[PDB]
Design a protein around this ligand. Sequence first.
Ligand SMILES: NC(=O)c1[nH+]cn([C@@H]2O[C@H](COP(=O)([O-])[O-])[C@@H](O)[C@H]2O)c1[O-]
Ligand SMILES: NC(=O)c1[nH+]cn([C@@H]2O[C@H](COP(=O)([O-])[O-])[C@@H](O)[C@H]2O)c1[O-]
Ligand SMILES: NC(=O)c1[nH+]cn([C@@H]2O[C@H](COP(=O)([O-])[O-])[C@@H](O)[C@H]2O)c1[O-]
Ligand SMILES: NC(=O)c1[nH+]cn([C@@H]2O[C@H](COP(=O)([O-])[O-])[C@@H](O)[C@H]2O)c1[O-]
Ligand SMILES: [K+]
Ligand SMILES: [K+]
Ligand SMILES: [K+]
Ligand SMILES: [K+]
Ligand SMILES: [K+]
Ligand SMILES: [K+]
Ligand SMILES: [K+]
Ligand SMILES: [K+]
Lengths: 362, 362, 362, 362
Amino acid sequence: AKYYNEPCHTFNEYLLIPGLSTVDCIPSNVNLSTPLVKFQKGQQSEINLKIPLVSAIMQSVSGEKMAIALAREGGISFIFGSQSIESQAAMVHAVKNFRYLVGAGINTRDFRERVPALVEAGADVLCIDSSDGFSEWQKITIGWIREKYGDKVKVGAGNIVDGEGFRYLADAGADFIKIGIGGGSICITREQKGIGRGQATAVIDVVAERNKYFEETGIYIPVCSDGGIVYDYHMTLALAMGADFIMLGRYFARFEESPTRKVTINGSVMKEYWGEGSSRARNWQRYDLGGKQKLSFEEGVDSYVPYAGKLKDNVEASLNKVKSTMCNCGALTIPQLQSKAKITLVSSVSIVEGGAHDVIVK
Amino acid sequence: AKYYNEPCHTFNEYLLIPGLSTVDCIPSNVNLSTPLVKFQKGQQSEINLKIPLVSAIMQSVSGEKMAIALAREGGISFIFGSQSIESQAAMVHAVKNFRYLVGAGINTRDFRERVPALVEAGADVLCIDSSDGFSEWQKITIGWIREKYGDKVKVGAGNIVDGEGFRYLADAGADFIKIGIGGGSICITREQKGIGRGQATAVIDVVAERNKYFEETGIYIPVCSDGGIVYDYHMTLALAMGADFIMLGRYFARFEESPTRKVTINGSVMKEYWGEGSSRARNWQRYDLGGKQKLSFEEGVDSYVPYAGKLKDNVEASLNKVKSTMCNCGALTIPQLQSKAKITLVSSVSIVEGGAHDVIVK
Amino acid sequence: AKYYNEPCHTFNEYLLIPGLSTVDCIPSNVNLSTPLVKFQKGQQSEINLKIPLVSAIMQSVSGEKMAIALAREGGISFIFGSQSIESQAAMVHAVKNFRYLVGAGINTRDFRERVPALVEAGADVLCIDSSDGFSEWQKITIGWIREKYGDKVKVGAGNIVDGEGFRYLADAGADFIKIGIGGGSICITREQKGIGRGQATAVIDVVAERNKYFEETGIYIPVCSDGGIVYDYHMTLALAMGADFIMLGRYFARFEESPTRKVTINGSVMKEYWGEGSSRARNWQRYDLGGKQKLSFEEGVDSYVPYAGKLKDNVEASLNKVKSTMCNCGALTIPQLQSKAKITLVSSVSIVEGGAHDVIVK
Amino acid sequence: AKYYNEPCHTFNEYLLIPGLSTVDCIPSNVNLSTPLVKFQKGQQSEINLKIPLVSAIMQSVSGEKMAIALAREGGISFIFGSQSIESQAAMVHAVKNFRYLVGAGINTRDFRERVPALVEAGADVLCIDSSDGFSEWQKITIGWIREKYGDKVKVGAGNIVDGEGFRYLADAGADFIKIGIGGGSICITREQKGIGRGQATAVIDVVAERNKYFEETGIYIPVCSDGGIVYDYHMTLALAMGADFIMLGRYFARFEESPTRKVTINGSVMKEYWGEGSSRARNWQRYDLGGKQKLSFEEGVDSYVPYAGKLKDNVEASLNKVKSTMCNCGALTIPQLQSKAKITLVSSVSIVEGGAHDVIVK
Ligand SMILES: NC(=O)c1[nH+]cn([C@@H]2O[C@H](COP(=O)([O-])[O-])[C@@H](O)[C@H]2O)c1[O-]
Ligand SMILES: NC(=O)c1[nH+]cn([C@@H]2O[C@H](COP(=O)([O-])[O-])[C@@H](O)[C@H]2O)c1[O-]
Ligand SMILES: NC(=O)c1[nH+]cn([C@@H]2O[C@H](COP(=O)([O-])[O-])[C@@H](O)[C@H]2O)c1[O-]
Ligand SMILES: NC(=O)c1[nH+]cn([C@@H]2O[C@H](COP(=O)([O-])[O-])[C@@H](O)[C@H]2O)c1[O-]
Ligand SMILES: [K+]
Ligand SMILES: [K+]
Ligand SMILES: [K+]
Ligand SMILES: [K+]
Ligand SMILES: [K+]
Ligand SMILES: [K+]
Ligand SMILES: [K+]
Ligand SMILES: [K+]
């Protein structure tokens, strides 16, 4: 077996150490644009978001209302694929003809039928939805798409957590690669199967490989930090570590625009939020290992998250914090932040010092 | 004194990082066979289990019903030796003539009488039951067996936690070596005597020495990770780290087939489970240091574990998780897993991220 | 991005290992004098405090009564600047003509008007109040002061946490540099923006750079450990690590002399204490990044701290502990302590051993 | 200031890894004898205990009854010195003429009068009682004793935690050196003054220096691990790390023979136990830094410990565990253990695995 020199870590263990802020480092001057799909050195991506936030490929998150609301704010939603091809295509079509950008998730089994339907519906980009994307199944799926559409259809892939996985999907032809296994708020894969890696360590490792790949091939492949975002500053950390954009489930599930019902639990207004690996969703394709067309066991839970209001207001508040921090770090663009960021791990005692302490908060 | 560069760790601190899964990496294609006794390079062990699980040499675990039920599923039980030679021989005989495989535990004191009786009863393999097997007492016991039976009788030995201990028992002639001191769920040896080592670190260290020994002698000695298995994924980790099979007490004590009584504690159906070092068992031979034929002090406790039902159903569920994970890692056999596994330590904060978080589980 | 070899740590994780105590190492012989502003090698600072304690630039801490009481004991207060120029100047004037030393906080926006008013009022030293002082805004402010007053006006600056930040402000001309981001008892910046560093690590790193700067230029720049002091021994640690003086908010807010109201909360007499970044204070200048003249979001909280009595009695008790420890370390002056101190990190288990344990405290 | 490469650790973080146990490694063959005072290479100490346990120099521990009971079992008590010279001398005299060995604590102030009185009373050995023994005060005290009695009077000294402190007291002429600052169960020095070091790290460091000193001078100076012993296995660890004997307070305070009252607290029979640094004891000499003859502030607490019965029965039970472990490690004497011991640090997760887990203890 192979071992590592250091244990993996995640977001709550890090802090950014401010660099020089020039007079032009004003939050209003910060440009949050970011590339969504791979491109050649010196050029621009064919698809650039205005903000680095994308909603998860989940039944309880990316519906028509979410896609429209997020697209309006500059991001993009990936309409969930854990539904019939016909219904998913209809959702994509409704968003495209509500021009707002919209993505759609696909699986490694019915892609020969689902892809044509989604392309026809007007999807701008696709993304294979898999817990563990380091597989020949994803290579086959991407290969078929390239075979039939060449570079006309953009397809994201994976969910790998190290350089090897990234390299495999990059060579396979993925337009962007998703990072993360087990970090999701409603995910229990790490406790059920024992696979995964701290989200931050995964991003840092994959980004290092992505940059080597870029120097070697001249091809820049955007990577997405998927799952584990709890606080707004976690967004800034993920971007600083090298992620081009961030995929979130819980963050968006709390909004009015999520397709779930609002429910009151103990005097608190909540919203339903469940994992694709829960018996409720039954998205067996996401965990498919060539076995029976059913969920062998649960890898996600059914839950409630606090209702946070409208997406627009929340996204605005979150990004204002991101932009402010970027200015503390002397960055006016995401690439600048990724270059200038000074990132340190924090001891548990330092964490205690970071919050309010030795006072009774009024 | 001698010190080490790193502290010891155990199962809960590790995770497997998935490798490439090929289209043939289907759970149904996974072969869980594993060698039980030492063999020569290029050859097969004289005894191979169909599944890598064996039940502990304990009064509250390995009785006749357990031995039959586990043998039926592909594993093997080691009938406890903390009972009269006559009664233990009778249990072995009943299992053999219920052909199901069955093992039997022996001690370093009455082996001249117990061994012949067990061989006569039809035991397929024996195993010295000792907390600390790094001793001349075990070497003497193994030597006597070899003297009287040559290689016809198979005897496991030890419970060592480092390369030195393994080497000693290997040279002594043990057919397989058991790893672990203090990791047992009902064991308090580490708190009473201050001896022991994290189970994972022990397995990793012993396996390293076992592989060097193999290259040096051409003799492959199977090793057993004994104790400390709490979750099903711990089984996968132990195997990935190099263990050929796993010995469990608590895991099996919870089943209908364990020889203990079912008792209701606070509306919950439980089963009795006690350590061999508890006053209830009085297995002083297991902790014998050439002193009086009595337990100097307790090193185990008397307890209750949740009733889990039938062994067959539980073992099936556990191994389905093991096989699934092996497929994520690209392995269809245990040796493949041990070769391909990528194993990382996990920070405490990463552990929190691994479970459900920031949601109210419904 | 840039990463570090070790995670940051803070006060609770350290202990001093006693050195040789000579017969002259008596608490009564300890000299707690310390320089407040930069000076040339071989010379003395133009301003030396008798004790290394200064009160925070906060509405809930440094008012007229506090400034007089602390000055009387040998320290100095920095009258808060989060108020009109006229009212702040009046406070400074009242203290100066109550001669007691007194400081005053300024911001990077209205300094052209505030500075003249404060100098006119008789302020002995000024200090830019900023969460993140690594900025051109501070350089511009210091430059203007030097332009108009040369070296006649002393101005402290910053709140940096590493060598780079220190170097920038030193070259900018600051008379003393303040260390610390996010360690304040009422501060939640690290949780809102994700920026900061463990206070101890920050002091140690900045001090190392300060000493290199001294050897290079012959100019000694005093540094201040600002925020995070919870226990009296934390003061000793900060000084031993290299800090010349310590800035405290919570510590002083608990005293009779703080400008806040005493309130009873659950039978306990408390005092109000709030952060400059709370909606109550609205000190937006402290977090200004060239944006709108308002607080974008809260970075501090409103709270209550236990009433501790008169400043004189408390400061006497605190410093008696500091002097005693200095004697255990064989130091009769702060520079001696900084030279002789032996400082070690402490494991969490060692921390448990440090307090009373395994006994019921009567 | 000076820093260290690793943080300090203490007893609960360590475990012994068993070595080879020969047939002669029987608990009954273990010799627990140990030297109390320094001697020349190749020779024997003038005072050897039969067991490596000594009672603390405390009012609530070492009275006449304790001294007699412990001496009977092979150890020695150091009659507390925080009382009049006359009364302490009377206690020593009573023990000597009850021949049982007995020690007596002295301080760095009234030694010119206390020492003669104690020698006259028949004390076999003396020991300076100080929290921080790295001082000229101890050197002066030892020097006076040597001046007046030469090598006829044996005097222990210190309480240092590193090689430097040991070296100083060794050169000063101490017959044995005590290790430890802040580890005491009733001690809060580390929380009041911020000085100290993990007990295990202190012992390990001092022992290393002691062994170098021995090679350099041919003089073997016994060292004592003082404070922090919570479990019986902690005794084994301290000895394995190099300590010749162990000083305990809490351990003995629980016995019938301790001079304190038995009190019932919540249906549990307890015994009073307080630190010498508590207002109850007022042992200001122990924390004397040449200041006023009074306790500047408390460094110890007043408490209750569980009543454990008679010393004889408890000491027998404790040492049976020590002897058993020594046999697991292949040692029949303390020097053998110190040579053969294999000591590892243990992760927090490994600690959890070490106790009973995942079972309901009946
Ligand atoms: N285990 C599951 O059932 C599951 N369902 C969805 N997800 C993952 O968790 C991410 C959302 O994480 P989060 O933003 O809620 O923390 C999704 O984008 C997807 O990668 C899951 O891990
Ligand atoms: N301390 C004891 O009394 C004791 N009794 C049995 N055992 C050990 O603990 C193992 C079972 O551990 P576990 O599967 O319950 O965690 C047994 O195989 C044996 O090695 C014990 O450590
Ligand atoms: N976040 C806030 O609102 C805030 N207000 C004041 N402070 C900082 O916290 C310090 C006082 O910290 P403390 O002594 O209360 O721990 C001040 O000197 C200042 O640097 C703050 O961080
Ligand atoms: N702080 C105190 O008041 C105090 N009083 C006694 N002691 C120390 O603590 C030791 C006893 O520790 P323990 O065996 O109770 O853990 C004594 O031998 C002495 O070195 C103290 O630290
Ligand atoms: K900055
Ligand atoms: K804070
Ligand atoms: K895989
Ligand atoms: K999770
Ligand atoms: K000292
Ligand atoms: K303590
Ligand atoms: K042994
Ligand atoms: K255990």
